[PDB]
Design an enzyme around this catalytic site. Structure first.
Site, PDB file in Angstrom:
ATOM      1  N   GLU A   1     -78.210 -42.183  -9.601  1.00  0.00           N
ATOM      2  CA  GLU A   1     -78.697 -41.624 -10.044  1.00  0.00           C
ATOM      3  C   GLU A   1     -78.101 -40.711 -11.062  1.00  0.00           C
ATOM      4  OE1 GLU A   1     -80.072 -39.049  -6.748  1.00  0.00           O
ATOM      5  OE2 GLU A   1     -80.619 -36.951  -8.243  1.00  0.00           O
TER       6      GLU A   1
ATOM      7  N   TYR B   1     -49.340 -31.056 -19.849  1.00  0.00           N
ATOM      8  CA  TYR B   1     -50.090 -32.057 -19.111  1.00  0.00           C
ATOM      9  C   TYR B   1     -51.232 -31.713 -17.532  1.00  0.00           C
ATOM     10  CZ  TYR B   1     -49.259 -36.021 -21.919  1.00  0.00           C
ATOM     11  OH  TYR B   1     -49.013 -36.552 -23.480  1.00  0.00           O
TER      12      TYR B   1
ATOM     13  N   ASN C   1     -58.222 -34.471 -25.046  1.00  0.00           N
ATOM     14  CA  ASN C   1     -57.727 -33.600 -25.094  1.00  0.00           C
ATOM     15  C   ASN C   1     -57.436 -32.077 -26.283  1.00  0.00           C
ATOM     16  OD1 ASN C   1     -56.004 -34.329 -22.444  1.00  0.00           O
ATOM     17  ND2 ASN C   1     -54.845 -35.748 -23.753  1.00  0.00           N
TER      18      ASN C   1
ATOM     19  N   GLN D   1     -52.171 -39.776 -13.391  1.00  0.00           N
ATOM     20  CA  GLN D   1     -51.826 -38.105 -13.342  1.00  0.00           C
ATOM     21  C   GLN D   1     -52.789 -37.396 -12.581  1.00  0.00           C
ATOM     22  OE1 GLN D   1     -48.745 -37.329 -16.220  1.00  0.00           O
ATOM     23  NE2 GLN D   1     -47.533 -37.423 -15.190  1.00  0.00           N
TER      24      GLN D   1
ATOM     25  N   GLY E   1     -51.798 -48.281 -23.855  1.00  0.00           N
ATOM     26  CA  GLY E   1     -51.795 -49.495 -24.692  1.00  0.00           C
ATOM     27  C   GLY E   1     -52.328 -50.210 -22.739  1.00  0.00           C
ATOM     28  N   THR E   2     -51.982 -49.386 -21.580  1.00  0.00           N
ATOM     29  CA  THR E   2     -52.613 -49.787 -20.427  1.00  0.00           C
ATOM     30  C   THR E   2     -53.896 -49.366 -19.985  1.00  0.00           C
ATOM     31  OG1 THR E   2     -50.321 -49.527 -19.488  1.00  0.00           O
ATOM     32  CG2 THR E   2     -51.912 -49.259 -17.766  1.00  0.00           C
TER      33      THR E   2
ATOM     34  N   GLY F   1     -53.289 -46.118 -16.069  1.00  0.00           N
ATOM     35  CA  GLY F   1     -52.688 -45.809 -16.997  1.00  0.00           C
ATOM     36  C   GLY F   1     -51.788 -43.924 -15.918  1.00  0.00           C
TER      37      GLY F   1
ATOM     38  N   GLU G   1     -53.363 -45.108 -30.997  1.00  0.00           N
ATOM     39  CA  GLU G   1     -54.167 -44.815 -30.298  1.00  0.00           C
ATOM     40  C   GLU G   1     -56.033 -45.034 -30.830  1.00  0.00           C
ATOM     41  OE1 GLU G   1     -51.886 -41.476 -27.773  1.00  0.00           O
ATOM     42  OE2 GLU G   1     -53.535 -40.995 -27.853  1.00  0.00           O
TER      43      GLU G   1
ATOM     44  N   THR H   1     -49.365 -39.528 -28.142  1.00  0.00           N
ATOM     45  CA  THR H   1     -47.912 -40.675 -27.927  1.00  0.00           C
ATOM     46  C   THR H   1     -47.919 -42.058 -28.315  1.00  0.00           C
ATOM     47  OG1 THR H   1     -49.148 -41.380 -25.916  1.00  0.00           O
ATOM     48  CG2 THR H   1     -48.163 -39.865 -25.355  1.00  0.00           C
TER      49      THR H   1
HETATM   50  N1  LIG Z   1     -55.634 -35.253 -19.939  1.00  0.00           N
HETATM   51  C1  LIG Z   1     -53.716 -36.084 -19.869  1.00  0.00           C
HETATM   52  N2  LIG Z   1     -53.864 -37.161 -20.888  1.00  0.00           N
HETATM   53  C2  LIG Z   1     -53.020 -37.143 -20.196  1.00  0.00           C
HETATM   54  C3  LIG Z   1     -51.661 -37.081 -20.214  1.00  0.00           C
HETATM   55  N3  LIG Z   1     -51.182 -38.717 -19.640  1.00  0.00           N
HETATM   56  C4  LIG Z   1     -51.082 -39.421 -20.726  1.00  0.00           C
HETATM   57  N4  LIG Z   1     -52.337 -38.945 -21.799  1.00  0.00           N
HETATM   58  C5  LIG Z   1     -53.145 -39.111 -23.058  1.00  0.00           C
HETATM   59  O1  LIG Z   1     -52.532 -40.526 -22.767  1.00  0.00           O
HETATM   60  C6  LIG Z   1     -52.390 -41.273 -24.196  1.00  0.00           C
HETATM   61  C7  LIG Z   1     -51.734 -42.146 -23.758  1.00  0.00           C
HETATM   62  O2  LIG Z   1     -51.318 -42.925 -22.862  1.00  0.00           O
HETATM   63  P1  LIG Z   1     -50.867 -42.841 -21.789  1.00  0.00           P
HETATM   64  O3  LIG Z   1     -51.795 -42.481 -20.086  1.00  0.00           O
HETATM   65  O4  LIG Z   1     -49.869 -41.855 -21.653  1.00  0.00           O
HETATM   66  O5  LIG Z   1     -49.906 -44.614 -21.145  1.00  0.00           O
HETATM   67  P2  LIG Z   1     -50.413 -45.714 -20.618  1.00  0.00           P
HETATM   68  O6  LIG Z   1     -52.142 -45.810 -19.559  1.00  0.00           O
HETATM   69  O7  LIG Z   1     -49.370 -45.755 -19.719  1.00  0.00           O
HETATM   70  O8  LIG Z   1     -50.223 -46.836 -21.219  1.00  0.00           O
HETATM   71  P3  LIG Z   1     -48.641 -47.574 -21.772  1.00  0.00           P
HETATM   72  O9  LIG Z   1     -48.101 -46.901 -21.595  1.00  0.00           O
HETATM   73  O10 LIG Z   1     -49.006 -47.969 -23.255  1.00  0.00           O
HETATM   74  O11 LIG Z   1     -49.004 -48.959 -21.192  1.00  0.00           O
HETATM   75  C8  LIG Z   1     -52.235 -40.178 -24.778  1.00  0.00           C
HETATM   76  O12 LIG Z   1     -52.670 -40.180 -25.712  1.00  0.00           O
HETATM   77  C9  LIG Z   1     -51.785 -39.164 -24.453  1.00  0.00           C
HETATM   78  O13 LIG Z   1     -52.377 -37.998 -24.392  1.00  0.00           O
HETATM   79  C10 LIG Z   1     -52.279 -36.539 -18.809  1.00  0.00           C
HETATM   80  O14 LIG Z   1     -51.471 -35.941 -17.786  1.00  0.00           O
HETATM   81  N5  LIG Z   1     -53.457 -35.925 -19.442  1.00  0.00           N
HETATM   82  C1  LIG Z   2     -44.325 -41.971 -36.096  1.00  0.00           C
HETATM   83  O1  LIG Z   2     -45.323 -41.590 -34.645  1.00  0.00           O
HETATM   84  C2  LIG Z   2     -44.930 -42.037 -33.364  1.00  0.00           C
HETATM   85  C3  LIG Z   2     -45.620 -42.258 -32.755  1.00  0.00           C
HETATM   86  C4  LIG Z   2     -44.747 -42.906 -31.100  1.00  0.00           C
HETATM   87  C5  LIG Z   2     -43.542 -42.749 -30.942  1.00  0.00           C
HETATM   88  N1  LIG Z   2     -42.710 -43.393 -29.833  1.00  0.00           N
HETATM   89  C6  LIG Z   2     -41.301 -43.415 -30.446  1.00  0.00           C
HETATM   90  C7  LIG Z   2     -40.455 -44.300 -29.676  1.00  0.00           C
HETATM   91  O2  LIG Z   2     -39.908 -44.385 -28.371  1.00  0.00           O
HETATM   92  C8  LIG Z   2     -38.531 -43.368 -29.938  1.00  0.00           C
HETATM   93  C9  LIG Z   2     -37.944 -44.218 -29.469  1.00  0.00           C
HETATM   94  C10 LIG Z   2     -36.482 -43.875 -29.843  1.00  0.00           C
HETATM   95  C11 LIG Z   2     -36.172 -42.587 -30.832  1.00  0.00           C
HETATM   96  C12 LIG Z   2     -37.331 -42.550 -30.882  1.00  0.00           C
HETATM   97  C13 LIG Z   2     -38.940 -42.012 -30.096  1.00  0.00           C
HETATM   98  C14 LIG Z   2     -41.330 -42.990 -32.072  1.00  0.00           C
HETATM   99  C15 LIG Z   2     -42.689 -42.652 -32.246  1.00  0.00           C
HETATM  100  C16 LIG Z   2     -43.454 -42.235 -33.217  1.00  0.00           C
HETATM  101 MG   LIG Z   3     -47.702 -45.782 -19.297  1.00  0.00          MG
END
Ligand SMILES: Nc1nc2c(ncn2[C@@H]2O[C@H](COP(=O)(O)OP(=O)(O)OP(=O)(O)O)[C@@H](O)[C@H]2O)c(=O)[nH]1
Ligand SMILES: COc1ccc2[nH]c(C(=O)c3ccccc3)cc2c1
Ligand SMILES: [Mg+2]
Ligand SMILES: Nc1ncnc2c1ncn2[C@@H]1O[C@H](COP(=O)(O)OP(=O)(O)CP(=O)(O)O)[C@@H](O)[C@H]1O
Ligand SMILES: Nc1nc2c(ncn2[C@@H]2O[C@H](COP(=O)(O)OP(=O)(O)O)[C@@H](O)[C@H]2O)c(=O)[nH]1
Ligand SMILES: [Mg+2]
Ligand SMILES: [Mg+2]
Lengths: 54, 427, 437, 334
Positions: free
Chosen positions: C254, C224, C206, C15, C144-145, C10, C183, C179
């Site tokens: 260990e 990030y 975080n 990153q 999700g990943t 993910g 979550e 994000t």
């Molecule tokens: N500390 C830290 N947290 C991160 C970073 N990138 C994403 N996150 C956290 O990861 C959570 C979301 O998961 P992601 O890793 O962005 O998404 P993913 O694993 O790629 O899964 P999907 O995009 O939904 O398919 C969020 O709550 C972010 O705060 C990063 O670079 N550093």
């Molecule tokens: C309610 O909290 C949340 C949490 C995650 C979210 N992602 C998105 C979007 O991908 C999006 C797509 C088009 C226009 C604006 C936003 C909206 C959103 C709201």
């Molecule tokens: Mg992703």
């Protein structure tokens, strides 16, 4: 108080200090679980396309 | 993640055309289809809406649909008229006469296959199609009747793709015909089932904003569309430009829609401005936050205080203190936590885009899934029942093969949608 | 020498993997092109750093690592990053559409159509190992990943590598950098499915990292990049014993031995110090006693909680820089008489100390300042259960109304798995209670 | 504009505080489970401290100190005093006590009892009150729960007129900075009928709680003598003041008890903050020597003193953290 198993090297050293003493699923089990969910998706999609057919 | 745009009917094509002319300017694309921008931020996700073509010209992934050539000819002669792929102009000649039945069952059924051929040809070019967005009115016949027909057939051929709509709601304050509540109720029945996301653009709201706030004595559809294109630009910002959010049409659905049928959003915008009238003073972040949540800025004529927010998405544009924005957005949820459901933690999310819209150094777009949206459907329902209890103007529809039962069914489902929204307002 | 394979799943995992492997290179003096002048055994060797790096006849040192994301944008920056030459195309796997912040979509739907490929690329590295210990898995709870595909991968590795250990570096969800609204769902779901498949998991809230960056680095809105460069330091401190000569935590087994008495309770609390801003003009270097005392300040923990109101099962102190055993013992003796450090009755009240004379490396142009000595405490305290409580509560709030559940069911998941997952967490919360009070 | 929540309805103290807060017009009460609060008037049991201080953009505060139960539980109080070097065994102001588990500190208690049995010393104890160990070792076992046996003060200070027994109640407020504030107004929960030293299990003249006692209202209204009267009595009957003879010891015990557990409960560098109102119960013997009986973490107030105290809580414990748009507290310095 008691330091034990001291091990020194060129990079550093490690040890242990004590202050006080004391007082899985199979491969196909997985693949059936994944396929079971896939069938649930296709059923849902089928009920949709059937409804749309109506 | 490409999006296929569709615009049906007079309204759909007119707001659709303005939508493209607005974001084309934001992405530095001229009417010729050539890029002449200063930043590369403009191009990083331009493929979401544009196709890269010969001479590296950018062609909108748009499909223009109508049952009469009148409005589409205006588009083609418009400012960004020649940017559109000429083969994506699919139109009839008979029109729909503001009749849902004609657009959905007779006149539109004859043209719909031609449209889907264009939809298919566009989709096959997509690296990974994420979904469709449709612009249309609900009060007419084509955008309303044929639009929902297209949606139904698009869902059949692309059941795993997201369906998004910008649906313009009819209002007596801005009315073409008396049968608009009929067409609208019939369309809502379709939208509840066959869309994942629907931006409720209420003409009643757009009129009031023009009259009350913008002090426009007699607003035109042009004035109304200034608000639409501004809102459309805002709610697509996260899709068109890179961001922390990683936004697409599915992620928006997953996060905004706790229950599948309750996917009717209240758009909002700040600052409210009129055409020609330029600002000189920029809004402070506290002002952007206050206004974008005020009812006077909502594009759906609903009092958010008469309901509760299930989810909220706020998009700030322009260079500003992201700290201050967070302080204000957190202040929002803490000042009136009663209008936010407590059973969805952190249901308000914020995003930022360095690029502001044209004519503004900074702005704020609002996307709320409020339970107060029921006021909109209740309004349509009352206007519907007033006529339907006497079966008035119904001969226009039965003449196209429709039965009264279908009206009663559409009425019942919309009333269910209302009660469903009322359910979570008392949770 | 025994090899370790790092798996980054993910966006969060990838990153952070970038931050870590960037830091690893600077510590081992490895260049972006993979050349390591200090390594005189060209084309191979069984040194400590070979645990994380394989060698080619051309003298290139490549990470024993695999990057996997269901969406190409993040990993594409690795493919074109400054350490692009460092990695082999086969190590960077990318899908075409992400899991859309949906556990079920990452696990069942899209996870099913890429799991076999990933395991094949992992097997590619495993075949280059003389004696593989296990895997280090970096991911998020909220993605999700990071949640969905991870749990599926952890299940298969237990089948394909039963005898091998599996450690986790997991990103606990925080609203300030969230994000997705769902979550909490993804976190509970991936925890339940991964619990029996993980031997030791280092959780990083975080929220904690965000506030540490604000409080100590004076970064008003941490990106990030800011969070990860700090997380990479913690991970480096934990994995240093696997990459350098030492006698403490020399292998993955260990870690479980010295930090995880009870299998299920395998979430050690990490506490790092000192964190000093690079832009801090005048800084008074902190002593062994001062940095060690800071390890018991909640403001320095990777998860905000109160160890005073809990019980310790184990505690490892990992120093880096100018440190000697005497100054450590002196610090501990003082801290014990001023802080509440309760161990469970069936454990010895003590500390496993590890020192690496090489001070912590800082990324040039980074936010961290060079320090003469630093420390990372790994304490398995029941107090970390507070994080499970917070998370399980947010879960209960949404699931009571079955909000958003339809998105998961729509991916072929059963609504029952929500309750089964939540039940396992309820059991976990109680396990922490029996031990804690 | 601040916000708070109420999760303890039976509490009379903060019920008045919640009223006062709303009266300022700068505090809004939220529902029980609304997490977006600035203040939490939490429950007495199972208070979720773990969910506090995790709301971004909100400085959170709670009216309870996590870990303060060590002091506010009889079994824990004894253990705390016996194991803490700051207090330890030779604690002069705490009665001789022993944790005794039912069907442990038994075998050591008998050693104490026997030596005092032999030496003709005062040999009455209390869990109830008896001069024979075997009689109510059978008592702690037949009820089930944990109990603490404690040396009964056989020569208590007795008020005249009446020859009556009493126990002092002091209200102490510890803020987020761990400033210990003693409420200047205490109260004497006296006995109404003369204390005698022969018949011990007529529990009306030995136990001086507001419950059991309700000859009521004979000497003072509601079996509640305040400091003004008690001070005057000491001056007239014993040629001393309440400050000297008793209150110095009280201020000492209060401070000593709270400074002992400070490092365990302090919220100085925590992500959430805590304050808490305490109720220390003291006992005075004929030689004007103050003994600590117990501490209560969820104390009630006297009707006369509710308004002044509750308003005080808002001033130094709440408004100090959440400011708005001569003092009734003695600050115990340390
Ligand atoms: N500390 C830290 N947290 C991160 C970073 N990138 C994403 N996150 C956290 O990861 C959570 C979301 O998961 P992601 O890793 O962005 O998404 P993913 O694993 O790629 O899964 P999907 O995009 O939904 O398919 C969020 O709550 C972010 O705060 C990063 O670079 N550093
Ligand atoms: C309610 O909290 C949340 C949490 C995650 C979210 N992602 C998105 C979007 O991908 C999006 C797509 C088009 C226009 C604006 C936003 C909206 C959103 C709201
Ligand atoms: Mg992703
Ligand atoms: N060692 C001792 N010697 C003499 N009297 C004692 C004593 N221990 C307790 N008492 C008496 O016991 C009664 C109170 O017992 P205790 O204080 O444990 O009850 P309690 O706290 O549940 C009532 P409250 O909640 O108001 O404090 C008082 O009347 C006090 O005089
Ligand atoms: N905002 C807006 N609404 C419009 C416009 N044109 C029509 N409408 C609304 O749409 C309804 C008429 O539908 P119309 O688009 O003309 O029907 P169609 O062409 O057959 O699909 C009425 O309720 C109008 O208020 C427009 O340009 N802007
Ligand atoms: Mg028209
Ligand atoms: Mg070598």
């Amino acid at each position: 108080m008691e330091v034990i198993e001291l091990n020194k090297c060129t990079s550093g050293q490690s040890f242990e200090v004590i202050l006080k003493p004391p007082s899985d699923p199979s491969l196909e089990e997985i693949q059936k679980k994944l396929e079971a969910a896939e069938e649930r998706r296709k059923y849902q999609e089928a009920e949709l396309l059937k409804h749309l057919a109506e | 993640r490409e999006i296929v745009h569709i615009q049906a009917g007079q309204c759909g094509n007119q707001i659709g055309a303005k939508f493209w002319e607005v974001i084309s300017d934001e992405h530095g694309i001229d009417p010729t289809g050539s890029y002449h921008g200063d930043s590369d931020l403009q191009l990083e996700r331009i493929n979401v809406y544009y196709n890269e073509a010969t001479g590296n010209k950018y062609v909108p992934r748009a499909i223009l649909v109508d049952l009469e050539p009148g409005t589409m000819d205006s588009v083609r002669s418009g400012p960004f008229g020649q940017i559109f792929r000429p083969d994506n102009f699919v139109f009839g000649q008979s029109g729909a006469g503001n009749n849902w039945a004609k657009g959905h069952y007779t006149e539109g059924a004859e043209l719909v296959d031609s449209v889907l051929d264009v939809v298919r040809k566009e989709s096959e070019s997509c690296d990974c199609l994420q979904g469709f967005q449709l612009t249309h009115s609900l009060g007419g016949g084509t955008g309303s009747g044929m639009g929902t027909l297209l949606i139904s057939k698009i869902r059949e051929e692309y059941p795993d793709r997201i369906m998004n709509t910008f649906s313009v709601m009819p209002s007596p304050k801005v009315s073409d015909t008396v049968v608009e509540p009929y067409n609208a109720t019939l369309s809502v029945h379709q939208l509840v089932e066959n869309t994942d996301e629907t931006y409720c653009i209420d003409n009643e709201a757009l009129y009031d904003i023009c009259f009350r706030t913008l002090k426009l004595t007699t607003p035109t559809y042009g004035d109304l569309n200034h608000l639409v294109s501004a809102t459309m630009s805002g709610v697509t910002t996260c899709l068109r430009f890179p961001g922390q959010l990683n936004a697409d049409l599915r992620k928006l659905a997953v996060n905004m829609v706790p229950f599948p049928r309750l996917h009717f959003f209240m758009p909002g915008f700040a600052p409210l401005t009129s055409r020609g009238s330029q600002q000189y003073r920029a809004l402070t972040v506290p002002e952007l936050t206050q206004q974008m949540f005020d009812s006077k800025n909502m594009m759906a004529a609903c009092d958010p205080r008469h309901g509760r927010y299930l989810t909220v998405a706020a998009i700030f544009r322009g260079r500003m203190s992201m700290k201050e924005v967070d302080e204000q957005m957190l202040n929002v949820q803490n000042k009136n936590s009663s209008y936010f459901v407590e059973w969805i933690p952190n249901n308000v999310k914020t995003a930022v885009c360095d690029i502001p819209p044209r004519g503004l150094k900074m702005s704020a777009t609002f996307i709320g899934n409020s339970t107060a949206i029921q006021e909109l459907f209740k309004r349509i329902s009352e206007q519907f029942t007033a006529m339907f209890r006497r079966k008035a103007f119904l001969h226009w529809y039965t003449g196209e093969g429709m039965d009264e039962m279908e009206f009663t069914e559409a009425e019942s489902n919309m009333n269910d949608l209302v009660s469903e929204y009322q359910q979570y307002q008392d949770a | 020498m025994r090899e370790c394979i790092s798996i980054h799943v993910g966006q969060a995992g990838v990153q952070i993997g970038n931050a870590c492997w960037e830091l690893y290179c600077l510590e081992h003096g490895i260049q972006p092109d993979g050349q390591m002048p200090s390594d005189k055994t060209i084309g191979g060797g069984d040194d400590s750093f070979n645990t994380f790096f394989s060698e080619t006849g051309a003298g290139k040192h490549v990470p024993r690592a695999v990057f996997v994301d269901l969406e190409p944008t993040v990993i594409d920056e690795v493919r074109t990053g400054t350490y692009r030459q460092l990695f082999h195309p086969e190590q960077l796997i990318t899908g075409k559409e992400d899991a859309a912040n949906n556990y079920a979509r990452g696990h069942y739907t899209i996870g099913k159509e890429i799991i076999d490929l990933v395991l094949d690329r992992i097997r590619k590295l495993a075949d280059q190992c003389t004696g593989l210990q296990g895997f280090l898995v970096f991911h998020s709870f909220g993605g999700g990943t990071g949640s969905g595909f991870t749990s599926l991968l952890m299940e298969r590795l237990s089948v394909d590598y039963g005898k091998k250990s599996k450690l986790e570096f997991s990103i606990y969800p925080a609203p300030q950098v969230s994000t997705a609204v769902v979550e909490p769902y993804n976190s509970i779901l991936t925890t339940h499915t991964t619990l029996e498949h993980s031997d030791c998991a280092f959780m990083v809230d975080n929220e904690a990292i965000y506030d540490i960056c604000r409080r100590n680095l004076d970064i008003e809105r941490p990106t990030y990049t800011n969070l990860n460069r700090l997380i990479s330091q913690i991970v480096s401190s934990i994995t240093a014993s696997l990459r350098f000569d030492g006698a403490l935590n020399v292998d993955l087994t260990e870690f479980q031995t010295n930090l995880v008495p009870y299998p299920r309770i395998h979430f050690p609390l990490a506490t790092y110090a000192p964190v000093i801003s690079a832009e801090k003009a005048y800084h008074e270097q902190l002593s062994v006693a001062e940095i060690t005392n800071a390890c018991f300040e909640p403001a320095n923990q990777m998860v905000k909680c109160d160890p005073r109101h809990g019980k310790y099962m184990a505690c490892c102190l990992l120093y880096r820089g100018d440190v000697v055993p005497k100054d450590v013992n002196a610090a501990i003796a003082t801290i014990k008489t001023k802080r509440s450090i309760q161990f469970v009755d069936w454990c010895p009240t003590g500390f496993k100390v590890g020192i690496n004379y090489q001070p912590p490396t800082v990324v040039p142009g980074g936010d961290l300042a060079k320090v003469q000595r630093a420390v990372c405490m790994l304490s398995n305290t029941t107090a970390i259960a507070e994080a499970w409580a917070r998370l399980d509560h947010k879960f209960d709030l949404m699931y009571a109304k079955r909000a958003f559940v339809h998105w998961y069911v729509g991916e072929g998941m059963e609504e029952g798995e929500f309750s089964e997952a939540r039940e396992d967490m309820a059991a976990l919360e109680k396990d922490y209670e029996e031990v804690g009070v | 504009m601040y916000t708070f929540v109420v999760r303890d309805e039976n509490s009379s103290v903060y019920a008045e505080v919640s009223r006062l807060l709303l009266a300022t017009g700068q505090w809004k009460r939220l529902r029980k489970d609304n997490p977006r609060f600035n203040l939490m008037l939490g429950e007495r049991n199972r208070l979720p401290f773990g969910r506090l201080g995790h709301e971004p953009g909100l400085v959170q505060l709670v009216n309870y100190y996590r870990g303060a139960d060590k002091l506010c539980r009889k079994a824990s109080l004894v253990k705390l005093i016996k194991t803490s070097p700051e207090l330890s065994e030779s604690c002069t102001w705490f009665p001789e006590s022993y944790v005794i588990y039912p069907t442990d500190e038994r075998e050591v208690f008998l050693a104490a009892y026997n030596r005092r049995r032999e030496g003709r010393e005062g040999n009455v104890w209390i869990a109830l009150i008896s001069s024979e160990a075997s009689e109510l070792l059978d008592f702690i076992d037949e009820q089930g729960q944990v109990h603490v046996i404690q040396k009964y003060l056989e020569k208590p200070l007795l008020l005249e007129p009446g020859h009556r027994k009493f126990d002092i109640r002091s209200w102490v407020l510890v803020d987020h900075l761990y400033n210990i504030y003693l409420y200047r107004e205490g109260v004497l929960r006296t006995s109404s009928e003369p204390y005698n030293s022969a018949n011990f299990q007529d529990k009306t003249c030995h136990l001086t709680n507001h419950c059991i006692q309700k000859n009521y209202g004979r000497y003072e209204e509601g079996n509640e003598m305040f400091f003004e009267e008690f001070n005057q009595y000491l001056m007239d009957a014993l040629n001393t003041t309440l400050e000297n003879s008793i209150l110095l010891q009280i201020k000492h015990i209060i401070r000593s008890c709270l400074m002992c557990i400070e490092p365990a409960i302090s919220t100085k560098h925590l992500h959430y903050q805590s304050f808490q109102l305490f109720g220390f119960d003291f006992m005075v013997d004929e030689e004007l020597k103050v003994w600590l009986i117990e501490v209560n973490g969820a104390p009630a107030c006297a009707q006369k003193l509710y308004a002044e105290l509750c308003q005080g809580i808002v001033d130094v414990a709440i408004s100090s953290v959440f400011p708005l748009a001569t003092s009734i507290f003695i600050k115990l310095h340390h």
